[PDB]
């Protein structure tokens, strides 16, 4: 599996990771492989606001958030955050505001020739739609 | 291009396997067709009657599509094409074409005649 | 469970205040003299469903039978040697047991006591009047599965290596 089909490049990434993993020991790989695979839903779309709450604090932030998908602008009028964390793509305001911060928009490949280990990397992925539920008639969720 | 002992190990049903009642009634035609009907003694498969045919009868990879006696094939049908096989031997080997003319043909032979390659459509016109 | 044993007071049934359950046994074999005292077992029959004290002190080839303690028809014929008689004593133990433990003409099942098997005949008196003295004349002979059985010592010794050794006994019979 892991496929997904499309953007060759997108595929190439799969390789480098599938290439690591099985290869490398560890986890942050295993995880980010079976992650590289997943379909457009159940694939969040974590926002800087997130990648921010997340970092600072939780008692650790010298780590590199690795949101395996897009990564939204959002508007938390101030704070944020100066950290290095990326992957799939990033929205304007994002790698932009993440550029004010400013850490490094990591491009999940680069962030592997670095992340070679996996240490100080926080895998942050999150949320549920968009749609409820079903099935309205109890009552319960709506529509 | 040394060939697995699978000459005649191909494969069973050396035998058309053709449409059911059609071995009879007039405008019943080609093949396999699985009398897909609610009763036909075939689709059921009581003793006697056609034999239907289904994966597992298939031919054993290590002597699969080639398959010939020589082995492989290709309608070499334009000199350069009739290369496309130059360095590659034996295994694989060419056939001319429904299409490929009379003149051009003697060549195609010729040319490959020497390039080292085998013509199935040996003859032709 | 369970384990080990003994007994020795009557034949049989004993030692309660806690009690027994099963079959202190000794494979009720036989059968002295030539071809008398025989497994005579009635073919002359309308089927397996029968039995009752066959034992002609009559003569021998002058032996006689029965058909129940009695109340579905209870007959009583004679016999002599090789007919409604031989030649199977059962398929024993295993059918031979079913039998004994279907002498619930006194309340058992998997309970206490065993043969406790009624009166005499070389049942006891046999391995119970005397105590097979040779059980001693047994010790004398060690003899062992020994000689060639066995002979591993003077043979398979060179194989007790293969014992667990897929090894030597892979070398020959047992492969893939």
């Amino acid at each position: 599996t892991a496929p997904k089909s499309d953007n060759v490049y997108l595929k190439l990434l799969v390789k480098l990771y599938t290439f690591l993993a099985r290869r490398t020991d560890a986890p942050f790989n295993k995880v980010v492989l079976k992650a590289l695979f997943l379909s457009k839903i159940n694939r969040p779309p974590v926002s800087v606001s997130r990648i921010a709450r997340a970092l600072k604090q939780e008692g650790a932030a010298n780590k590199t958030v690795v949101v395996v998908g897009t990564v939204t602008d959002d508007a938390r009028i101030f704070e944020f955050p100066k950290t290095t964390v990326a992957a799939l793509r990033f929205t304007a305001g994002a790698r932009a505001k993440i550029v004010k911060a400013g850490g490094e928009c990591i491009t999940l490949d680069q962030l592997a020739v670095r992340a070679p280990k996996g240490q100080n990397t926080l895998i942050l992925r999150g949320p549920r739609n968009s749609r409820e539920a079903v099935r309205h008639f109890g009552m319960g969720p709506h529509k | 291009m040394a060939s697995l002992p699978h000459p005649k190990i191909v494969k069973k049903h050396t035998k058309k396997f053709k449409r059911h009642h059609s071995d009879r009634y007039h405008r019943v035609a080609e093949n396999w067709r699985k009398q897909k009907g609610i009763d036909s003694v075939v689709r059921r498969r009581f003793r006697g009657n056609i034999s239907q045919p289904k994966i597992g009868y298939g031919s054993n990879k290590k002597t699969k599509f080639l398959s010939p006696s020589g082995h492989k094939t290709f309608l070499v049908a334009n000199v350069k094409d009739l290369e496309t096989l130059t360095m590659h031997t034996k295994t694989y080997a060419a056939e001319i074409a429904h299409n490929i003319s009379a003149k051009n043909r003697v060549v195609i032979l010729a040319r490959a005649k020497a390039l080292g390659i085998k013509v199935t459509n040996p003859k032709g016109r | 469970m369970s384990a080990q044993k003994a007994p020795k007071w009557y034949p049989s049934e004993d030692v309660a205040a806690l009690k027994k359950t099963r079959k202190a046994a000794r494979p009720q074999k036989l059968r002295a003299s030539l071809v008398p005292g025989t497994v005579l077992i009635l073919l002359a029959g309308r089927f397996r469903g029968k039995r009752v004290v066959y034992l002609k002190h009559l003569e021998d080839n002058t032996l006689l039978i029965s058909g129940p303690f009695k109340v579905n028809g209870v007959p009583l014929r004679r016999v002599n040697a090789r007919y409604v008689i031989a030649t199977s004593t059962k398929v024993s133990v295993e059918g031979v047991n079913v039998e004994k433990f279907n002498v619930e003409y006194f309340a058992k099942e998997k309970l206490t006591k065993k043969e406790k098997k009624e009166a005499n005949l070389f049942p006891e008196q046999q391995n119970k009047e005397i105590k097979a003295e040779r059980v001693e004349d047994q010790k004398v002979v060690d003899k062992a599965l020994i000689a060639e059985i066995k002979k591993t010592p003077l043979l398979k010794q060179y194989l007790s290596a293969s014992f667990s050794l897929k090894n030597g006994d892979k070398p020959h019979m047992l492969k893939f």
């Binding site: - | - | 044993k5 202190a24 105590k131 097979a132 007790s160 667990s164 897929k166």
Partner: protein, 215 residues
């Protein structure tokens, strides 16, 4: 230099070496444990008729309980029973310890299976022969995902005197795929029985032979 190619070697070789003179400082030796007792019990019964009784002696092992029938049209409980006593094939067969959660089950199946009651040799062969692995045989080799202990002759040396870590051992062996009767058949009608002839029941003794012909 590549004397490292001769490093592991000295090891491996001698290494293997040890283990086996081990596999065999034992694998015989035990064929005395086994032998030893088999005489005792004899002698025991004899000390019996040294006087009286003795000597009722209980067992225990059990019993290759080998499926003497089918799939198509079988019970509904007694089905799942078979399934969990784990024997999903016609003429197939496992081994199961004589414990009442075993026994009980056995009986709930008795009708349609065949509680033999293993012999020694029958175990050897029924091991070694068709018997082995989730995939075949090489001693301490494969047989040391043990790890309690190793030796095909040790899988036996447990199984055929079960107890101790023992029968998580029997968790191992896809079991049987034994032969259909081979020589003899088992008299006339089989698929119903016990005594009365047939099959369907718990021989002993005469539990082996109907196995003896198979593997």
């Amino acid at each position: 230099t590549a004397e490292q190619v001769a490093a592991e070697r000295a090891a491996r070789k001698a290494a293997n070496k040890e283990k086996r003179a081990i596999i065999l400082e034992r694998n015989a030796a035990y064929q005395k444990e086994y032998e030893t007792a088999e005489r005792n019990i004899i002698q025991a019964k004899r000390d019996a008729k040294a006087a009286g009784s003795y000597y009722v002696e209980a067992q225990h092992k059990l019993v290759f309980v080998v499926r003497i029938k089918g799939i198509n049209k079988i019970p509904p409980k007694p089905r799942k029973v078979l399934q969990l006593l784990r024997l999903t094939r016609i003429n197939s067969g496992t081994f199961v310890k004589v414990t009442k959660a075993t026994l009980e089950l056995l009986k709930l199946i008795e009708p349609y299976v065949a509680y033999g009651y293993p012999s020694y040799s029958t175990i050897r062969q029924l091991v070694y022969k068709r018997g082995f692995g989730k995939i075949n045989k090489q001693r301490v080799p494969l047989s040391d995902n043990a790890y309690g202990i190793l030796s095909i002759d040790d899988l036996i040396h447990e199984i055929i005197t079960v107890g101790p870590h023992f029968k998580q051992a029997n968790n191992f062996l896809w079991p049987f795929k034994l032969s259909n009767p081979s020589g003899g058949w088992g008299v006339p009608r089989k698929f119903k029985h016990f005594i009365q002839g047939g099959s369907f029941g718990n021989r002993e003794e005469f539990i082996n032979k109907l196995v003896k012909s198979m593997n």
